[PDB]
């Protein structure tokens, strides 16, 4: 599992855990939110610039 741990840590800024659901971290949330914003002008677009 060593190659997967490195890839997940880079993507999610946290080590994978057996008892925590693998969600992708804050990058996954930001990617999901920008997709909503691109589709329509009425989307919230709440992701900070920082």
């Amino acid at each position: 599992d060593v190659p997967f741990v490195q890839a997940y840590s880079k993507f999610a800024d946290d080590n994978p855990r057996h008892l925590r659901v693998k969600t992708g971290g804050k990058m996954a949330n930001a990617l999901t939110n920008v997709i909503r914003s691109y589709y329509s002008i009425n989307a919230p677009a709440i992701v900070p610039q920082v």
Binding site: V2, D13, D14
Partner: protein
Amino acid sequence: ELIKVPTIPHNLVLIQSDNGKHALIKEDLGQWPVETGISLVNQAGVFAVQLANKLGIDKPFVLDAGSNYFTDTSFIDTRKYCTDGLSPREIQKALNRQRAYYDRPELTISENKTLLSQSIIYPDADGNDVSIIFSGAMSHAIFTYAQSQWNKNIIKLDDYIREITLTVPKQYRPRRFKEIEHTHGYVYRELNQGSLLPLVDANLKESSSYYFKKLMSSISNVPVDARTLQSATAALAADTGQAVNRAQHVSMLTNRLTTANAPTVRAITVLTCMFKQFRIGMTYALDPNIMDVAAATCMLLFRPAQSISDEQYRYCLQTMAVFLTNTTYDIVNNDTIDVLKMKLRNQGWPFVERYNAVEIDMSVEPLRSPGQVGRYYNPFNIDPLTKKHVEDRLEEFINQVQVGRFRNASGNAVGTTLAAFLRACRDKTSANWRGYSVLVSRYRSLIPNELFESLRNISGEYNINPQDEHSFFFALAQINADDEFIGAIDKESAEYLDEYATLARDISNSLTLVKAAFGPLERTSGSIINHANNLNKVINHVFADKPLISETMLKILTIDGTTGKDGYRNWLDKLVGHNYPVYVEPVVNIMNFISARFVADSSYFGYTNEIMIMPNHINVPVDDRFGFRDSPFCTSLPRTIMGNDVRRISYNVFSMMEDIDDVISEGFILYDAYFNFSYDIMTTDGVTRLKEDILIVTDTGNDIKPIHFYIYFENRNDKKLRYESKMNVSYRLYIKTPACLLPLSDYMRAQHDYVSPSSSRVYIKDPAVVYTRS
């Protein structure tokens, strides 16, 4: 051999405040520096070995903690109280001090008995002893995993014997084991067989030359019967009339006889019949004589057809045609084998054919060749079933040579000389083939099947002189198997077995090193330069201190005159991109486990991936379980503070920041780096602070100074320390709470189980099942 570990390596310590209000259990596994910018997994590998040595699990072992117990004075209590791990009396003392602070009554007798009986030893169904003790979580996980890995190689003696029955020769007296050993005997053996092909296939000339030289030295010392040549020479002189006055072809054969190189040739004879394809060469004189023809005929008749190449076979036929048929080398230069065979047969010469030796199967399975059948060639091309030459018409062919007319239309001087010589060689080979067959079989048992089918006479060092060949068969010596010689072979078998086992380990080590260190090459200068530098760095490190590879490998690699470092560097180079399967050993499994936990649980080993710097006026949730004053530990680094997400900056960006003063006012999280930290827990009360300033600003970049927490326990109603914390400290550094810390209230989480094997088991150091005959 196997090591019996007497005590379980618990790593628990008890820290309690002076007033006794707060107490904690901490597992101390050491602090290991971690460097950023390079792979963490590679660093974890170095620390895994050091950690294994600290716990005592690096070498094969079995736990022997069954006898560490005592029995209570009460007559009802028949339980066995374990003495390993953290003492339950230490927890009882800590718990009573806590109750004294709160003015609660001390632990009752019933409560004391339950606490004092937590650590026990009880037997299981299989006779093993199970120890329940207080110990660290990672110490328990790593120690128990290493136990299961080493136990894979511990088997009963009867199981080991059944796996090695097929390799036991008949000429050895069986060993009588004691009755206890048959019932309760166990052996630690690694039964995986590693191939020697990676060394042999890559370096064929070096491997073949090394083993041929070692074998030749042994065979050269075999005793032989001392039989004079006078009887053989006198018979030859009578059959072909030899006159002192006249010059005859028979004299040229006789004056050239010599037994000086007989031990060397007879070792070549064994080598031809011991290996699948051992090809020998032979160079004749520029002007062939009757000796060359006799030598060439002897080679074709009494040597295996597998030892004679087609080019050598044609060269032998060309030499006969030049002498017997009165032609030149230039004429027969372009003639093929079939054409040459017709020329000699028309003149009356029938010895123009190679003969295949008959294979004989070994009685037992060859060493390092599981589930395989060995073979070797019978010497002198004699069929063992018929006890005569493969050619059934050899008597008729010799008579045909006798009446033939070669080199002269009138007379039979050449034919009679060759026929009489060839009859002598036939008789000697018939009488003495059994001794050579036994000699070949004995040396065949030394080599595995891989060496039997792979080694070749590439260099051509072992070439037989024509004078030595014809004198070998004319003056063949019977083989005498002295008792001293027999014992010498038994010593060689032990040394050969150790050498093969050593080589297998070195090959497995080298194959692991190549995969981890070197990638694939590209047709670019950068790839070639990178590979060359990395190759030199690895070679310098492996040969430093005690060399990784043994002296046996270095002897094979240096057989051509190259240095040991140079020979290893070339062989490692060829191994890049190998598809050879490497069996994973128990020690590799253990190290990968500790490496995985080092990456997964970083707080145990003193480093973390994230730190937070926040102003003092901002209130953050903290871990209040331990009663620390101004605790620098958070259960998790907060996602939001005051309704806004905490800003996260990578260490590289923070290093290059020139507006760092504006950023620190708000607070931020630092990540993308490994932060080494240390802490000290003081029993008194005081201001919790850091040893050094948090950050250092330079014209080149910003950096974080080494982290060392001074942590004190908290007395809430202390105005002096409360004011100093708020006013004398402006910024605070937070990290996730280390997982090694555990409150005293949760002391039942430290209970863990260790299983030790039965004490009835006896371990056998020498599991071999045979003795020497004498």
